Design an enzyme around this catalytic site. Sequence first.
Site, PDB file in Angstrom:
ATOM      1  N   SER A 133       0.817  -1.208   0.000  1.00  0.00           N
ATOM      2  CA  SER A 133       0.000   0.000   0.000  1.00  0.00           C
ATOM      3  C   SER A 133       0.853   1.260   0.000  1.00  0.00           C
ATOM      4  CB  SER A 133      -0.935  -0.007   1.205  1.00  0.00           C
ATOM      5  OG  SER A 133      -1.702   1.181   1.252  1.00  0.00           O
ATOM      6  N   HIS A 192      -4.957  -5.817  -0.929  1.00  0.00           N
ATOM      7  CA  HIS A 192      -5.066  -4.616  -1.745  1.00  0.00           C
ATOM      8  C   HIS A 192      -5.252  -4.897  -3.228  1.00  0.00           C
ATOM      9  CE1 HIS A 192      -4.554  -1.059   0.766  1.00  0.00           C
ATOM     10  NE2 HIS A 192      -3.737  -1.764   1.526  1.00  0.00           N
ATOM     11  N   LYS A 234     -11.207  -3.848   1.841  1.00  0.00           N
ATOM     12  CA  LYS A 234     -10.729  -2.879   0.862  1.00  0.00           C
ATOM     13  C   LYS A 234     -11.697  -2.743  -0.308  1.00  0.00           C
ATOM     14  CE  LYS A 234      -6.919  -2.556   3.307  1.00  0.00           C
ATOM     15  NZ  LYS A 234      -6.819  -3.856   4.021  1.00  0.00           N
TER      16      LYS A 234
END
Lengths: 492, 492, 464
Positions: free
Chosen positions: A267, A295, A327
């Site tokens: 990230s 992610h 997410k």
Amino acid sequence: GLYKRPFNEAFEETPMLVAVLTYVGYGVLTLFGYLRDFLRYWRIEKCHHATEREEQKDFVSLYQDFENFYTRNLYMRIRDNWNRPICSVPGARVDIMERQSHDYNWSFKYTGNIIKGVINMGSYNYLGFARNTGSCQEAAAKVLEEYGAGVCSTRQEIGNLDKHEELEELVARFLGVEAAMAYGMGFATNSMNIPALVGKGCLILSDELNHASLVLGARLSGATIRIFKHNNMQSLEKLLKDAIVYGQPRTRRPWKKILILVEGIYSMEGSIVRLPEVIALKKKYKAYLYLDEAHSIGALGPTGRGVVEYFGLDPEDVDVMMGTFTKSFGASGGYIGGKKELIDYLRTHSHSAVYATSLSPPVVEQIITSMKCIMGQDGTSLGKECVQQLAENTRYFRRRLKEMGFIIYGNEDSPVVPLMLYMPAKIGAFGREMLKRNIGVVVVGFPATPIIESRARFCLSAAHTKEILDTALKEIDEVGDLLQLKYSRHRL
Amino acid sequence: GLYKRPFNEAFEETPMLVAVLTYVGYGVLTLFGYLRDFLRYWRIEKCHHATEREEQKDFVSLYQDFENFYTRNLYMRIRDNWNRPICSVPGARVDIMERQSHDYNWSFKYTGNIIKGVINMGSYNYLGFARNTGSCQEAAAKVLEEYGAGVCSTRQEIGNLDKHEELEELVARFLGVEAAMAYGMGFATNSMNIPALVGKGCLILSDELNHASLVLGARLSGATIRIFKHNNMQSLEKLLKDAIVYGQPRTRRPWKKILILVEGIYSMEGSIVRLPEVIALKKKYKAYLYLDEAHSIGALGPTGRGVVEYFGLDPEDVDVMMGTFTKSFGASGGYIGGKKELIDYLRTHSHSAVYATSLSPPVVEQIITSMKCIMGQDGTSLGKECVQQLAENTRYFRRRLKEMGFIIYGNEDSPVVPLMLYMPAKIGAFGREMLKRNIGVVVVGFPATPIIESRARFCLSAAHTKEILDTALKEIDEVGDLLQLKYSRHRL
Amino acid sequence: LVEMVQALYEAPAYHLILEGILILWIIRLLFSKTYKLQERSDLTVKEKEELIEEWQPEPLVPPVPKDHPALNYNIVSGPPSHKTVVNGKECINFASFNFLGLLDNPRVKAAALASLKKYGVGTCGPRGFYGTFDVHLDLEDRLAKFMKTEEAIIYSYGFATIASAIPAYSKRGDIVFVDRAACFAIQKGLQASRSDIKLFKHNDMADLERLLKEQEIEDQKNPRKARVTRRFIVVEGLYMNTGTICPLPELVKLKYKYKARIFLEESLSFGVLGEHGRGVTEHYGINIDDIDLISANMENALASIGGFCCGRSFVIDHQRLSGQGYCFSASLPPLLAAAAIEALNIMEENPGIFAVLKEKCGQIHKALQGISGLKVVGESLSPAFHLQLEESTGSREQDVRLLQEIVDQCMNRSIALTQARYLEKEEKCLPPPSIRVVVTVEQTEEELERAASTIKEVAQAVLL
């Protein structure tokens, strides 16, 4: 391993003058922090903090003062860039409750007014599933009405439901693996399942930028931990060779197991793992692969299946595929996918399976509806438009910021854009200036990062229209002119 | 391991003044040797030696001069104490051909006279089987008449005879082991069978005072060799622990095998191996035992079976028992005894079994007759009287020499008595003086031994009567008074 | 000596410096205890390749036995509540930790639905990065006011609450005195920190006194180290593994007499003990300020996901920056927080439900006494207690099989029971196998006595 498509990434080095000025600023801050600590110690300036109760003055002090140095002197000065409350759904535009401080961020008072329509670049909804009106909301409402909110037992006990079995089979179909298991927290997945797989006598090879959950899970188990450089296949190969050849440290013996912990998309850095090389190395050296895919499970891939689809690989090659629903899918939880024997061993010998309360029914219904929409079970054209729009937005935003003279980290495909600030004061300055123009961003400072690179993270979304991106880009250009944040030498 | 009987041995330390005088003598000899080398190099003194042929003056020199230093300057001065020819059976009394030198032992001329009736303390006949008249001589004569002398082929080829099978089965019965094999040389037994048992990747633990045959056999094989202190069980245990724990030197791996080479009686030192401790250590650490039993197969034991009978142990505990017929039985050859599988593997994969000529028929007949006499197959009272007389002679001689003020090494039971001279000149002086009084002894100097201890070895026999021992003892007392060889502080 | 000193003074400076460095060299040789051998060897490429080729790793997961009792999960076809359906059989729930029956109130569902309409399901980020809602602050204020305490902090998961609260305050070098029968979450929290752990006998203040005296003796030896060593005592208000309460007043006296802070875990006793249901502190009348940290989870009594820690601001403010389950995880979904707030409102409106639960627990515990082969373990005030085998076999598998036999036979009799589950290889002190009995205010007296009779009949038929 070979790539079917070019793999472009760029991490430009810091200009030397910028580094020198960064060190100047940090030195000034440290000296003034020492001065303020000296003033506070002698009661010359009244301390605005809570103290231990009078009945426990003879106890050993609970904390160590020096550990709070950077909290008292650096974090507190720019404390208003974090913990900003919101009173709306975290969509493309969010409403932020306004607060002010009169004692330099040591206490916050709440004003009645509410900032409205702030462009959201801090939330994690990649595919724009964070909505208060839709089919998923209606399904969640029906399941909330039927099942209630929250279960009051454990999976191995009476707390196992039919919704959980449906979710697990649907997840197994979505990933392409034989079986999968679902848990109620992404952090807990790692922290409670890594200790089950490995133990004392095994080796864990962890990347340089792993999440705190992976590190905590590796520490809870008794295995040995060795760290290789971020996306450095030479370092990984060298560590693998040394581990296989030289054996255990004290009493030279063959390792019982070797596990490699990696992530899909990192990230903060913004890079994508070199999965073909890692797979080739683990096949050559007979190692096991743990892939954190929080992610990338919705952001990456032509159909949004993750990194393995992005590289066009075989899901059966990765031993353990962990992921998080927070997410992309817009609901809490986590999952682990793999072969049937692994899933059965986890169902029997997992900390969260035995001691922890399972998921909530509305949450699992929302996950089921979102993932059915993504894979196209409903038949509506939605679920492909989201992925295509996310890809276009990422490409457009990254190209536009790179041609403006900024420094940006990571691949050209990752929907996470780390802009580089490099100085401690510019962190707070950027946060305040961007909030003043109705853009919400996230800023990261020294102790989290290396000392010279402090950054601001932009999270793109499929719900961001073109006009929103254009407005954000023009405001970013104005602020970059104001703060002189265009350090790039290649293009400007 | 525990001893059923007390285990007494004594190795008294050198007096300090004696060591200082020894070093003085060696320094004087070295300086004069350097002077003589300088004189010979410049042709000031004509060299009495052979030189390379004139046609090869441009070749590289065959030898290195410095390696012959101690040969030119120390060995040649006292060269007449060795290589003394005999013209009689090496019994209790031997006849020695007399020789004289006129150029200081660089050449020997033979006088016509023959020294007669020299008391023999240098030959190895422990049980007195070296006779020219007896039953063994008649059996050897008959077998020589029938079979001839020497075989002209190899065992695996047409050269295997029935006499060899008879000898092998009789030896297996004598030792108590399942099977045995016979070879034509004691040196060749070790040198040609140690490479067969072990190879590259195995460890050999060799005692500090092993024979040259054992060392050569260990070097011919590719195994690793480590040496422990003489009869030091602490050192052996430490080496075993380190070998098992730390593995192979470069690439740490478990050893394929561990073999311990030991001897029954060490000839020059005069000591007996601590067999119970070695057996216990090898049982605890799972090692294999090779026992050279050349000097004890006839001398030791109530019935003359060797060290294993002397300690009252089980012959099945020792993996390989090698032995030599030269010392006790009065005929050349050697043998290896053990389990049937070991003997079959040796019959298949031994260098001397494939490439070397087997034993001679008269020799095997003499061995068979002598060993039958020892074990009492003939029914005559002989074979027990020999062992009893050897024991009495050893005890009497050792006690009488120890109470005269001399320094003596080894156990009280070993029939080998090392008297200590400690100085380079006293070696030759003792040899010449003892020959002048009709006693034949063996003297050992520096490069063979450590520097401070130079010695004279007495080999007792069952053929030595009491009057012979008394005469030898009185002459030894007279010579010890003449040369001041009574260094013992404990008793004199 | 004086003449030698004068002679040395007669020497030049460089000569004396050379002699001094020579003497230092001599000292270095004398104290060069390392006997280096002067050798160096390195591996060969083919040797490395063959070493790599020999190595063969173990399988990722061990081969599974097919007799695993935990391999079979009970499947509930609907919401786990009173009159539930387990494995297709209509039953009465005696296994779910729903003490106040707040799972299926219309008001809780209405509040959750309103919050779901307003906000949605997911929060999409941590508390630091745009994950803080107004509902989170509202719930924290409500919890702080309910517990009569300065501040409270919310985690989104019950295990992580204590498993992250404990390591934040206890570091490497400190001393922790923890009860022997402590839940797995406390054990994992104590393992995450690297402090020294000293177990003492369950509910035994004699052993705690002995350990504290030994620690004071050790302190007397090295006072300087003892001035930088912190001491903690971790206890539970109502133990899950045994069902027994803890003696707070003696613990408070020991704290004030030995300078050791107290961490209380109140998952079971949060909403069941005390006149107003504020935990064991009301049960014993202890002042809230004596306990430094009180940790509970919102799942057993409030019937929603999450957990919380309450205390003074001085101790609570540290967890917002040092608690790992708080800093690096997404916040609690708003609808669960709204459900928790509504449950708190219901609990505050009428406090007689605690008395009703207490009387029901008394009835069932008194009635269950008298089983021939089973013994009741736990106190009369506990909502959840255990039934254990009086005489056990040599091995644990037969005990587990007998208990599962009883459970299945009861389940065919319209009574839904459960068996306590543990990780055998991981637990520090493994409790004996037992059947868990849980009481709820929804259950009527007739249903409780029917359950007692059915359990008695089945147990006396099976154990015999």
